[PDB]
Design a protein around this ligand. Sequence first.
Ligand SMILES: O=C(O)[C@@](O)(COP(=O)(O)O)[C@H](O)[C@H](O)COP(=O)(O)O
Ligand SMILES: O=C(O)[C@@](O)(COP(=O)(O)O)[C@H](O)[C@H](O)COP(=O)(O)O
Ligand SMILES: [Mg+2]
Ligand SMILES: [Mg+2]
Ligand SMILES: [Mg+2]
Lengths: 455, 457, 160
Amino acid sequence: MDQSNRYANLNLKESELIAGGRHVLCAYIMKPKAGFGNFIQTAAHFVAESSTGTNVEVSTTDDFTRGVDALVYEVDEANSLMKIAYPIELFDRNVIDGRAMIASFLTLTIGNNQGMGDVEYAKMYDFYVPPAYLKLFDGPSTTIKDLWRVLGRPVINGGFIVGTIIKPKLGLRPQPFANACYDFWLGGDFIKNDEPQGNQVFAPFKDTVRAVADAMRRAQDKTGEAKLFSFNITADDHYEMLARGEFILETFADNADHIAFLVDGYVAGPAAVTTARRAFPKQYLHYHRAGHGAVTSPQSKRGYTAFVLSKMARLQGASGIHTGTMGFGKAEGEAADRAIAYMITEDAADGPYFHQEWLGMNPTTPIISGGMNALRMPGFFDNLGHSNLIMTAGGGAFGHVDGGAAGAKSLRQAEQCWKQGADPVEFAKDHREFARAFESFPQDADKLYPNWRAK
Amino acid sequence: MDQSNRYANLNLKESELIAGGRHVLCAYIMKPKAGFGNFIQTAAHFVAESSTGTNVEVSTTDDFTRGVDALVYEVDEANSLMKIAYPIELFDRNVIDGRAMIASFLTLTIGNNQGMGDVEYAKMYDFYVPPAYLKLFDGPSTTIKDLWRVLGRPVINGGFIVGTIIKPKLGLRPQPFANACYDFWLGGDFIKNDEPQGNQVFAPFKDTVRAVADAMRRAQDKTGEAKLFSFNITADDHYEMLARGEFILETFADNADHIAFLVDGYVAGPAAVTTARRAFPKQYLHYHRAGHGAVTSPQSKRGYTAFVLSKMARLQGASGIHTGTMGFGKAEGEAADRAIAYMITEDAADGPYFHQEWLGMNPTTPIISGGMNALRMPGFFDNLGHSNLIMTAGGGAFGHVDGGAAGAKSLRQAEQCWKQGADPVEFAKDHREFARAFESFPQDADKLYPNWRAKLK
Amino acid sequence: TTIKDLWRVLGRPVINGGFIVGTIIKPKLGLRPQPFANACYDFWLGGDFIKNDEPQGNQVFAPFKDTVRAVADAMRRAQDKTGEAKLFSFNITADDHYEMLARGEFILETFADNADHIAFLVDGYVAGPAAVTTARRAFPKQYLHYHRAGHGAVTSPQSK
Ligand SMILES: O=C(O)[C@@](O)(COP(=O)(O)O)[C@H](O)[C@H](O)COP(=O)(O)O
Ligand SMILES: O=C(O)[C@@](O)(COP(=O)(O)O)[C@H](O)[C@H](O)COP(=O)(O)O
Ligand SMILES: [Mg+2]
Ligand SMILES: [Mg+2]
Ligand SMILES: [Mg+2]
């Protein structure tokens, strides 16, 4: 049944909808399935299933309901483009504090409409949130500044935070785990649990946290420098997350503010992210996005993009989120992904379709990870334009021929090489650890630098 | 770099892995991306990124780590098949009660491996959980039995629960909302919040809960029959969910056991499902899967299938989950989806690759929804084989020409027609509400029944 | 929770899983933490199930947490020795609702991966239904073991 006359108003202007500040805008790449309605008809049903309607008319509908209908206000069949305007009154609010929830946003904009039989596929590429709705989100409470302050760095442009992931992903018992932490910290700043590390039977949570706490104290006493750790506290059970978080902070004691909390936000869900954000607002919230690739991949024409996921995470209150290597690492990513970083860091930025004013909402740090090492870093920073971020290199550090500590220093020197604007191969002649990264990863060295070995 | 020698052991036999009861098995349909390694090489890296390794060798690796490596134990490149065995020691456990978490299962089996550059796509179609890992999951604490008991039905095979969704999806104010609830309950049993309904500014949560609570009392007093309602309590904030849930139960008072709690488990995540499951174990947990289509659709070759999503939901403790209309409704689905229903309801069932014993773990109700009406119901039931379930028809009920109450009765009579094995058109001549469903949805009636008008009016 | 859940842990059929061999640690009171745990290990070499005698808890000569830790170790040792699963029923009876939570919560964390091997015993007749309900609602996933000490005062045929 055709509901275009109700759910479609292409005479509406995007500029006025933004100026109004009473609508969330979303931009989709949608394709109707063969044997049903044309583009606007299918788009109309899409809007219905995403706001106020269903697949048939019902007597219970009144004029007030019609007033809050979402509306397709712009379409371009030749590019499969479909823009929809959602009145902000549609989105659910907390009874307890009147604040917004991303779960309601997801349910309407990217929920049931992903299972429509008359649609072949549809994927959100961008969305706009007006001021009245934006200010109702938590936003980040801790930022990279709080990490800079702990490291004794300038709170403004404090610079690059050298990081790694403890590898193997799983298998290290408590003390072997802590030993690797100590080694890396002799040359680096930051360490995160690999995403699945927690309370495995061969590496009990409390024993590992205790061993790492010891390793931090030993490393700090040895180097005279502050060291950071990001603990995975992900769990199905809200109270398990609290239990883990509380034990960590008590255990680390005077080093409690050296701690970040990692949450697998995509698989555990927004509910888990909000648990950490609200229970531990004074601890850096580290959003790990494992599993996101199922929808965000360009290979997928469903769900939403990495850009959308990142923008949402900032609203949820992620202190930092993985944004990818932007084509310079091992995972799917493009140089154009730099736009994602700007969107989560700046107070004003452009998306693929919408300009977003953030109204002083705190930034989310772009966390760079995925097959990175000292050799690949200069190219990466060139594409982004800055190094005010956290970069973790698991294999890149612990895969160094001279050990984790040397690996750490190679990452440090790689960024110093870019900041000096020096040539990597020439730079290497005065920095062994960086030069030794060439021998550690000769295939990367051969591709990135053609004749590094002779020179 | 090639890691086949470490992460691949094709000499392992599946029967031994199952008999051992120390491995979670997963079956994927994977395709390597062009310009990298062959199938087994790509499969090896996939396993590494899904268990103990990364894209390069590291000095920190010891033999104990190698002892817990996941392993590719079966492949079929001509069919793009890849089976992986995960040692159960890899999966995270709660510090507080030593129980399992689905979040850890997802992180390893379907996490980082979905973003691999050397893989074009990979999708989980089935998984096996041994007893030692299975018993560590919550499982459902409430089942349809408890809804049957309230309705005064037999607790075993209590039969069909006539349901609907309040439509419009959003827009009804508290009392107009409650009025629609009263109308439907005159002929039906069950009503659920549409998935986004909650605390909208035009329909305050507490005002609506109070209005619906009043409507239930009026409808039950009117019909002398018990009536059920499923409230959406989804929220980012764990404490918001508790606040909503606690207010509902107190408000309904002596009808508190008539209440189910709906959670948008896919978009809100397992954390939200577990909050409801553990805070309110005595209330029927209604898992709404909105958004699942992004990965479960056959159009997608990433993530996991609807079968996997449903199987996980049983472990998480869903009292019921939407399983789709199996090709008979408005959403993407196939007739073969009946197998999903069997997997979540039976104590033993076969998946696309693995046989699963549930060891007495409680069943999860298949909740049928999505463009269903009285006309489409007989066909759906024929494919499934039973009607011991909940079916909700929003448009099918409130889209009835004679109103929501008539709509309810049409759904009731439609199911009565299938169990009696009667001819729908002939059945209609003695059942008005069912007959009026033809005139309500003539397009469906014309295709499903060719000359109903001649046989009726 | 039912016997089905105990059968599942023991690796028995969940339907008609059969006889669960059990005992009570004797002396009723007097055993210090390690001698207590030693008796647990001994019995578990041939049996499945062990319950605290009804008054055993936090006596000054057998601190609760010290004993819980010792039994947990004994369970691991017994299970490693026999390759068989072992069950224990801890008395968590108390006047104070929050004491019951404290005992139960400490036990489950301590036993960790063996947490589902634990049953909770409550002296339901003398402590009352309130204590039974505390355990039932706080720990629905743990086998609730109702001990009826004192019941004889009214239930005895001698009493009318
Ligand atoms: O498990 C891993 O692979 C990593 O620890 C990187 O390890 P390596 O440094 O050894 O590659 C990260 O979790 C991924 O980068 C996540 O991907 P993303 O940031 O794109 O979400
Ligand atoms: O919002 C809706 O469209 C529904 O209320 C159906 O309404 P109608 O009865 O009016 O069609 C259900 O939430 C969908 O069935 C969900 O799909 P699924 O069950 O496949 O997850
Ligand atoms: Mg990782
Ligand atoms: Mg719905
Ligand atoms: Mg006794």
